């Protein structure tokens, strides 16, 4: 009905973004573990596997966040990387979910 149509139209999925770490040949594995623990609340075990994924797969997803939070994570991780003089690049892509 009219009320039910109003419900339907208000169920557009949230714009969500994957926060991604991209591999490079200069950033220490230990530093990537540190990043994952500091900014994403991963335990050492989970942080280690994701870091391995970065190294062997080329990139890995750190988690999925609202646009606003995702941009905040990217800013922080990149800042942390540069101040430690590493090229590690944290970026975003739309999840579609």
């Amino acid at each position: 009905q009219l009320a039910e149509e109003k419900v339907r139209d208000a169920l557009k999925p949230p714009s969500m973004y994957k926060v991604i770490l991209v591999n490079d040949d200069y950033t220490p594995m230990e530093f990537v573990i540190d990043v994952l623990q500091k900014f994403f609340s991963y335990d050492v075990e989970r942080a280690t596997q994701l870091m391995l994924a970065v190294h062997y797969q080329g990139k890995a997803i750190c988690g999925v966040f609202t646009a606003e939070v995702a941009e905040t994570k990217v800013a922080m991780v990149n800042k942390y990387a540069r101040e430690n003089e590493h090229p590690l690049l944290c970026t975003l892509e739309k999840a579609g979910a």
């Binding site: 591999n23 490079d24 040949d25 200069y26 950033t27 220490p28 594995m29 230990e30 990537v32 870091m51 970065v54 190294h55």
Partner: peptide, 11 residues
């Protein structure tokens, strides 16, 4: 990424 050096001292 860069792997850390292994630790060894007379084993």
């Amino acid at each position: 990424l860069v792997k850390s050096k292994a630790t060894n001292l007379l084993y």
